[PDB]
Amino acid sequence: KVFGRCELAAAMKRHGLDNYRGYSLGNWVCAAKFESNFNTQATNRNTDGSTDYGILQINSRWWCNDGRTPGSRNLCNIPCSALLSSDITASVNCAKKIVSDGNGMNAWVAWRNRCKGTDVQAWIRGCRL
Ligand SMILES: [Cl-]
Ligand SMILES: [Cl-]
Ligand SMILES: [Cl-]
Ligand SMILES: [Cl-]
Ligand SMILES: [Cl-]
Ligand SMILES: [Cl-]
Ligand code: NA
Ligand code: NA
Ligand SMILES: [Ru+3]
């Protein structure tokens, strides 16, 4: 599923990301924009052999099991395929664990490079929610 901007904002709010760990809704929408272009089916292989999955590009090195990332962990206790669903529940629940690990949203390189420090409220401007 490719979400619209306001559609994803509303879904993320419903799923409890608004101000989760102190990160306003626009931070999460901005991260999803640049990680996946709002496409739940996005996948990208990393040089080390791990793969990033879903709207928030969650990495099989640590967070999910894909059966092909030797020596990795599965800290969200989910198959990586669950992160590709049209329903964002699995991605949101795993993202909540990631953002709570100590480094906040800096875990998402696209967030650090393209959202951090910017007017992220623009990502939710005009949305009904
Ligand atoms: Cl509720
Ligand atoms: Cl990630
Ligand atoms: Cl594996
Ligand atoms: Cl933080
Ligand atoms: Cl950086
Ligand atoms: Cl800027
Ligand atoms: Na893994
Ligand atoms: Na990134
Ligand atoms: Ru939902």
From Swiss-Prot:
Keywords from the named record: Allergen, Antimicrobial, Bacteriolytic enzyme, Disulfide bond, Glycosidase, Hydrolase, Secreted, Signal
Catalyzed reactions per annotation: Hydrolysis of (1->4)-beta-linkages between N-acetylmuramic acid and N-acetyl-D-glucosamine residues in a peptidoglycan and between N-acetyl-D-glucosamine residues in chitodextrins
Pfam family for this entry, one: Lys
SMART domains listed in its UniProt record: LYZ1
CDD domains per UniProt: LYZ_C (cd16897)
Binding site for substrate: 101
Top EC class, one word: hydrolase
Tissue specificity of this protein: In the egg white and polymorphonuclear leukocytes.
Database matches in PROSITE patterns: GLYCOSYL_HYDROL_F22_1, GLYCOSYL_HYDROL_F22_2
Active site per UniProt: 35, 52
Record-listed E.C. numbers: 3.2.1.17
Function noted in UniProt: Lysozymes have primarily a bacteriolytic function; those in tissues and body fluids are associated with the monocyte-macrophage system and enhance the activity of immunoagents. Has bacteriolytic activity against M.luteus.
Miscellaneous comment as given in the Swiss-Prot or TrEMBL entry: Lysozyme C is capable of both hydrolysis and transglycosylation; it also shows a slight esterase activity. It acts rapidly on both peptide-substituted and unsubstituted peptidoglycan, and slowly on chitin oligosaccharides.
Name of the protein described by the UniProt record: Lysozyme C
